[PDB]
Symmetry: C3
Subunit: 334 residues, 3 copies
């Protein structure tokens, strides 16, 4: 009985970090409590001042990543403050019933609600807002994130050998549909509601104006780069709640990848580029062997370099000439 | 020798149903006879009167699902009545040789032909019309469906345990390319031939005007919902002959999924969203644990909610508070 | 130590052929030497005179396929002749570190460089040019190809049985973004640099004007068809460095397919259509059972038949009536 099980209260952290957690654990099922507060706000999404009338869980795109173990129960309190304009809810792809919880979490501004569900399937799963009649708008405006349900004994390779990571990063990729006026410039809206009609028209073209990691062009580049060192194993969680993407680590690989994101299935190894289906989260493990600045991107290179779907990983350590060596540097042709 | 084998005559039924069949069977190879009759007709495809100059097998989009077992021979008589305007044929992705049968089944209006092939590979396979020089037009206008070749001993999980379904549903998803006039309204054509030029121009933009399950926006919603009950296992067959899609069951999962659709391969479990490659059919098993109205949709939510790629499943039974419980209903924030 | 290992100098051949090589080999690790020379040139890409200001490795789209075995070291000399206008480099997805080698191979016109890396992961891997700030333009203009790293003991099925091919073909699929003028006709540019601005604008629409195999509409059709005979096993290598595709053999199958392209993973069997993620190369084995002309295409049939992503395979041999037979030829309906 879930009512009898012990409870824990997890504190969420902002992407791209993931709140501390055990991988393999000796604990039995618990009811893990989370709270998220919805924030509608106007956000600058590129380096030329373009704005999005955005909607978020906890003020971030993506929302924070929630981590539990298979057999736990997720107990979320969802808060929609009176300062917001729209109704909201939450659909957990990791949950069973009632449209993922959406039917049980409809909160108008000034309201909150608490949902419990059993996390009985391991994997990374999208959660997103889904208010009746407004679903794609709320999703593309920023209302999604990841629930990671780890196996109780941690991640395993296809032969059952234990796989372990030193840190986890969470990347949410957002296809944005920002309207333009007759002058060809992006529109700037005074309120969230005023953006709706024009945005739906752009959405229907199926052509994003921007595709961004974690809420903005360059959100994870230069100074905001993810970090690691040679010998470190990272888990890269990638969510896309609305549209396909194809992650790639430039100069690296997916050592073990669950592209459909479900840990009871064997991962694939040595991937150059993997595939996250729109409406899902997937995960890749990589152990760094070389130092330097890597790019992590959507390998539609137009989507990456022109539209914004690219970040960096800065990696410290010693160079390995066995793996790669410049034999002859750029020089005149003889 | 196939000429010596016994014959059966299957009666096809309209989607979303699939004609009755055995899963595991004790019978040996048979020549299974089918007949399909092509119907060109003008169909209303949305709730605002938009029409498609459509082309169908048996009057439906998709055409009916044909079901045989591995080792059987499919013997199809394809009829093109004199009331039709165009030539047609059939390409079975489940068949080997002669462009899937297309080269052997070219029928002008007033003609019919009979094709036999060995169904020697298990899986769900697209069949579609493919007249030389007219292939994509006939496909996007509605001429596709599924051939399901079941293993003789039924479906199996990755460890070889038997998997069984209580009912099968077939969903064909159709990316439509309906032209517009200078006034921005969809064009209405007096004849099939008159629609061709304008439609090709829309096709070349790679942007569907509509994306519909089973021939129309809302074809499987509200009153036309698929049905099931708690404890029932359903097989959801999903075909897309021209364009990728990403099926998702809201509030459910793919318990076992063959997204590439070929039953000799191990399925994946616990999928939130799967991927049907354009030019293929895939299949998912799910056993319902919760009652209520589910949505089954393409999880590009714009494609689903704006363009039409969404249906419903109404499920009877008793609610399970262990799996999901509303702890605190929507109420004022303290 | 790689410095001590023996060296070999491979001679590359033009697509769609792949240079001769052993599959299973008794040799140990070697340093395999290759040279490629970059050629910028204006190429006609369709049957109506449309031109692309193209960029190539070795004068071909795709660049030639390089073949080594797991454990070998690839040692490439990359030459950028003074007759070229732009800087170039190379990023090997099969390599570890320095952005796949791009950071170590920056060559201006008149320069060359030599890169070594360990091919320690089996599979087909994209290589492509990636000059800082110019990456997608160089890729979509033609600068990609495949590195195939074979397992030392050859290809294996999921149960470890040996798989062998009689010939290998390499198909590079190129999404092209050719600008149009106010008159609706494709633009023709005097120089490569003059094409840049207009091309970037088309790229940003995410809608290719053409999608071609091996550099041109019809590059592998009619007289340029791939060839085989009944009983022959072919490996079909398919690369797409920028955009997804979904290969299909009309009248055939993928007997064994590594759609993510990495040979340490078990292949899938009996595929009708597979999926190459943009930024990757995959591979399919097929043994021909029927003679005739097959089509090999991207099964978005608009992309294939309207935009150019289709080729042919002409297959000699004896027809098999067991696999497929015309029972009744096209004739009047009784
Ligand atoms: Cl890249
Ligand atoms: Cl959804
Ligand atoms: Cl086809
Ligand atoms: Cu919302
Ligand atoms: Cu969803
Ligand atoms: Cu037809
Ligand atoms: Cu086909
Ligand atoms: Cu270049
Ligand atoms: Cu790349």
């Amino acid at each position: 009985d879930a009512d009898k099980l012990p409870h824990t209260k997890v504190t969420l952290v902002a992407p791209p970090q993931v709140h501390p957690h055990e991988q393999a654990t000796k604990s039995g099922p618990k009811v893990v409590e989370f709270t998220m507060t919805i924030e509608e706000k106007k956000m600058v999404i590129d380096d030329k001042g373009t704005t999005l009338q955005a909607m978020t869980f906890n003020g971030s795109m993506p929302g924070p990543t929630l981590v539990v173990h298979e057999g736990d129960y997720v107990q979320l309190t969802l808060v929609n403050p009176a300062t917001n304009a729209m109704p909201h809810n939450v659909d957990f792809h990791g949950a069973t019933g009632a449209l993922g919880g959406a039917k049980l979490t409809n909160v108008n501004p000034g309201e909150q609600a608490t949902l419990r569900f059993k996390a009985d399937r391991s994997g990374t799963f999208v959660y997103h807002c889904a208010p009746e009649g407004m679903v794609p708008w709320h999703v593309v405006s920023g209302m999604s994130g990841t629930l990671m349900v780890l196996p109780r004994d941690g991640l395993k390779d296809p032969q059952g050998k234990p796989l372990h990571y030193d840190r986890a990063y969470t990347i949410g990729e957002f296809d944005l549909y920002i309207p333009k006026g007759p002058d060809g410039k992006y529109k700037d809206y005074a309120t969230l509601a005023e953006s709706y009609g024009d945005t739906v028209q752009v959405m229907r073209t199926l052509t994003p104006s921007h595709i961004v990691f974690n809420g903005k062009v360059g959100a994870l580049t230069g100074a905001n780069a993810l970090t690691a060192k040679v010998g470190e194993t990272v888990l890269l969680i990638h969510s896309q709640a609305n549209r396909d993407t194809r992650p790639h680590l430039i100069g690296g690989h997916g050592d073990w990848v669950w592209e459909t994101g479900k840990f009871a299935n064997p991962p694939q190894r040595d991937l150059e580029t993997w595939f996250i289906r729109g409406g899902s989260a997937g995960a890749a493990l990589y152990t760094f062997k070389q130092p330097g600045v890597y790019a992590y991107l959507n390998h539609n290179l137009i989507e990456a370099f022109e539209l914004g779907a690219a970040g960096h990983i800065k990696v410290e350590g010693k160079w390995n000439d066995d793996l790669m060596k410049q034999i002859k540097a750029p020089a005149p042709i003889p």
